[PDB]
Structure 1
Amino acid sequence: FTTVDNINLHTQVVDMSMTYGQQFGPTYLDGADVTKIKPHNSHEGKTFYVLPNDDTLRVEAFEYYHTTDPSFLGRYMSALNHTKKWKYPQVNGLTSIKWADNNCYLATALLTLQQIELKFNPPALQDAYYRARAGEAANFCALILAYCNKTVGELGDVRETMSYLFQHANLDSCKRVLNVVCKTCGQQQTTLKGVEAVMYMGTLSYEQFKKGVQIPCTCGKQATKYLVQQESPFVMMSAPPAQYELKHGTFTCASEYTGNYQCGHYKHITSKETLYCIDGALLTKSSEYKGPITDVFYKENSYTTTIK
Structure 2
Amino acid sequence: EVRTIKVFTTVDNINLHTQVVDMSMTYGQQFGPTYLDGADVTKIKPHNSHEGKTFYVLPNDDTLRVEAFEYYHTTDPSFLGRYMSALNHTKKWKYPQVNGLTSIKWADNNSYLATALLTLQQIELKFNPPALQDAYYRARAGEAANFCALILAYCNKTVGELGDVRETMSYLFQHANLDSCKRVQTTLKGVEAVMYMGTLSYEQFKKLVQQESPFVMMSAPPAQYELKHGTFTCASEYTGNYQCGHYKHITSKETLYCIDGALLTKSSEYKGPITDVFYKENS
Q: Shorter-normalised TM-score: what interval?
A: over 0.9
The CA deviation at 1:104 is: 0.9
Is the 8 Å Cα contact of residues 15 and 45 (structure 1) preserved in structure 2? no
TM-score by length of 1: 0.86
Is the 8 Å Cα contact of residues 27 and 42 (structure 2) preserved in structure 1? no
The CA deviation at 1:92 is: 1.4
The whole-number CA distance in structure 1 between the counterparts of 2:168 and 2:149 is 13
**Unaligned runs of at least 5 residues, structure 1:** 177-188, 212-226, 303-308
Stretch deviating more after TM superposition (20-29 or 235-244): 20-29
The CA deviation at 1:74 is: 0.4
Q: 1:78 to 1:16 in 2, by over 3 A?
A: closer
The CA deviation at 1:261 is: 3.2
| Cα deviation 1:228-277 (Å, max 9, x = unaligned) | 11011100100111111100111110000011234301001111221101
- State whether structure 2 residue 63 is matched by structure 1 residue 67: no
The whole-number CA distance in structure 1 between the counterparts of 2:49 and 2:38 is 17
- SS of 1:125's equivalent? helix
The CA deviation at 1:24 is: 1.0
The CA deviation at 1:129 is: 0.4
Is the 8 Å Cα contact of residues 25 and 42 (structure 2) preserved in structure 1? no
- SS of 1:13's equivalent? strand
The whole-number CA distance in structure 2 between the counterparts of 1:58 and 1:64 is 10
| Cα deviation 1:53-99 (Å, max 9, x = unaligned) | 11111000011111121111001111101111111001111011111
- SS of 1:290's equivalent? strand
Q: 1:17 to 1:81 in 2, by over 3 A?
A: closer
Match of 2:53 in 1: 46
- SS of 1:208's equivalent? coil
| Cα deviation 1:145-175 (Å, max 9, x = unaligned) | 0110111111111101111001100011011
| Cα deviation 1:89-137 (Å, max 9, x = unaligned) | 0111101111111111111100010100000000000000000011010
Larger Rg: 1
Is the 8 Å Cα contact of residues 23 and 45 (structure 2) preserved in structure 1? no
Is the 8 Å Cα contact of residues 10 and 54 (structure 2) preserved in structure 1? yes
- SS of 2:203's equivalent? helix
Instruction: State how 1:140-179 maps to structure 2 within 5 Å.
Output: 140-176=147-183
Two-structure CA RMSD over aligned residues (Å) = 1.7
The whole-number CA distance in structure 1 between the counterparts of 2:23 and 2:57 is 19
User: Which consecutive aligned stretches of 4+ in structure 1 deviate over 4 angstroms post-superposition?
Assistant: 15-22
Match of 1:296 in 2: 277
| Cα deviation 1:196-245 (Å, max 9, x = unaligned) | 0001111101111256xxxxxxxxxxxxxxx1110111001001111111
Aligned length: 275
Is the 8 Å Cα contact of residues 245 and 290 (structure 1) preserved in structure 2? yes
- SS of 1:132's equivalent? helix
Q: 1:21 to 1:101 in 2, by over 3 A?
A: closer
The whole-number CA distance in structure 1 between the counterparts of 2:206 and 2:94 is 41
Match of 1:11 in 2: 18
The whole-number CA distance in structure 2 between the counterparts of 1:246 and 1:120 is 29
**Unaligned runs of at least 5 residues, structure 2:** 1-7
The CA deviation at 1:21 is: 6.4
The whole-number CA distance in structure 1 between the counterparts of 2:88 and 2:275 is 30
Is the 8 Å Cα contact of residues 27 and 33 (structure 2) preserved in structure 1? no
Is the 8 Å Cα contact of residues 95 and 104 (structure 2) preserved in structure 1? yes
Q: 1:23 to 1:231 in 2, by over 3 A?
A: same
The whole-number CA distance in structure 2 between the counterparts of 1:116 and 1:19 is 45
Instruction: State how 1:134-283 maps to structure 2 within 5 Å.
Output: 134-176=141-183, 189-209=185-205, 227-283=208-264
- SS of 2:248's equivalent? strand
Q: 1:262 to 1:116 in 2, by over 3 A?
A: same
TM-score by length of 2: 0.93
- SS of 1:200's equivalent? coil
Is the 8 Å Cα contact of residues 210 and 228 (structure 1) preserved in structure 2? no
Stretch deviating more after TM superposition (256-265 or 198-207): 256-265
Is the 8 Å Cα contact of residues 36 and 55 (structure 2) preserved in structure 1? yes
Is the 8 Å Cα contact of residues 15 and 44 (structure 1) preserved in structure 2? no
The CA deviation at 1:20 is: 7.0
The CA deviation at 1:41 is: 2.2
- Greater share of strand residues, 1 or 2? 1
Is the 8 Å Cα contact of residues 22 and 36 (structure 1) preserved in structure 2? no
The CA deviation at 1:17 is: 8.6
Is the 8 Å Cα contact of residues 26 and 42 (structure 2) preserved in structure 1? no
Identity of aligned residues (%): 100
- SS of 2:196's equivalent? strand
The whole-number CA distance in structure 2 between the counterparts of 1:20 and 1:161 is 34
